[PDB]
Homo-oligomer: A and B are copies of this chain.
Amino acid sequence: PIVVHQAISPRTLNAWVKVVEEKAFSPEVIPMFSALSEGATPQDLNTMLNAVGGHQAAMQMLKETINEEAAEWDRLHPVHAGPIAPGQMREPRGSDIAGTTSTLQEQIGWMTHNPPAPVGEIYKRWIILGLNKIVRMYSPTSILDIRQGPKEPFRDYVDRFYKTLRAEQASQEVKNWMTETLLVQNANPDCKTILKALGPGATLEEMMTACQG
């Protein structure tokens, strides 16, 4: 990464590979990825993705997404040809941002320029976009099917609900609505009755303490 440049740390790299081995594509993999790639160059970012053995269906989807974002980038930032002046960098293309048509030193040039052409953070955006698609698609459950069982402690139901929620394809307002409707609606008869009695203004803290017994 950049803090000029240093090599991606072996411990960071192995951390990233361990995460993908164990967790597959659970939601928490994405903040984990962001943390391990803070200040990363496109090179470092490619290193991280390429280091993954297996899950090549997902890694291929991630390439396709990256190439979409690259094409969009080109479309919005059309190249202006000419001799690049002394003390200046060329305008990065879609592929320069994703690291396949740029050198490390060009990447360092962009990231440390005044003002910066922040290509790592652009590429990280695109990567995370692709990671989000995969997480969603690889989620086994649907939020509409999370139903508290007759003798299931409320806390375990809430744990399943919000896990499934975190992997859903939905904006914040749509998630807010799933909480407004489904959580209470899909509780078991006893808890459901008690939570209806608390009203629709009640906090999760309130609801959980209410169905403790």
* Contact across chains for B28 and A204 when beta carbons are under 8 A apart: no
Chain B's closest residue to A205 (CB) is B61
Chain B CB within 8 A of A128 CB: no
A163/B204 in contact, CB under 8 A:
no
A53–B23 touching, CB < 8 Å? yes
A88 interfacial by beta-carbon distance below 8 Å: no
Among A31-39, A77-85, A90-98, A188-196, the stretch in contact with B: A31-39
| A-side interface residues, number (CB < 8 Å) | 54
- Contacting residues, chain B, for A158 (C-beta < 8 A): 56-57, 60
B15, B59, B137: the one contacting A10 at CB < 8 Å is B15
Cα separation A61 to B209 with both chains bound (whole Å)? 12
A22 nearest CB across to chain B (Å)? 10
CB 8 Å contact bits of A169-213 with B (1 = contact, 0 = none)? 000000000000000000000000000000000011100110000
Chain B's closest residue to A57 (CB) is B158
Q: Once the chains are docked, how many angstroms separate the CA of A161 from the CA of B26?
A: 23
CA distance A158 to B65 in the complex (A): 17
The residue on B at minimum CB distance from A172 is: B100
Complex alpha-carbon distance, A150 and B9, angstroms? 44
Alpha-carbon distance between A210 and B28 when the two chains are bound, in angstroms: 26
Is A27 positioned at the interface, with any CB of B under 8 Å from its CB? yes
Given A28-B51, A59-B162, also A1-B7 (CB < 8 A):
yes
Query: Does A145 reach chain B (CB closer than 8 Å)?
Result: no
Kindly state whether residue A112 has any CB partner on chain B within 8 Å. Answer: no
Q: Determine if B10 and A56 form an interchain contact, defined as CB atoms under 8 angstroms apart.
A: no
Closest residue to A162 on the B side, CB-wise? B56
Given that A47-B35, A60-B204, A61-B208 are known contacts, is A28 also in contact with B7, CB under 8 Å in the complex? no
A54 touches B209 (CB 8 A): no
* B residues in contact with A56, CB < 8 Å: 158-159, 161-163, 165-166
With contacts A7-B35, A9-B10 known, what are 8 further pairs, Cβ within 8 A?
A3-B7, A10-B12, A13-B32, A26-B53, A28-B53, A30-B50, A34-B47, A60-B158
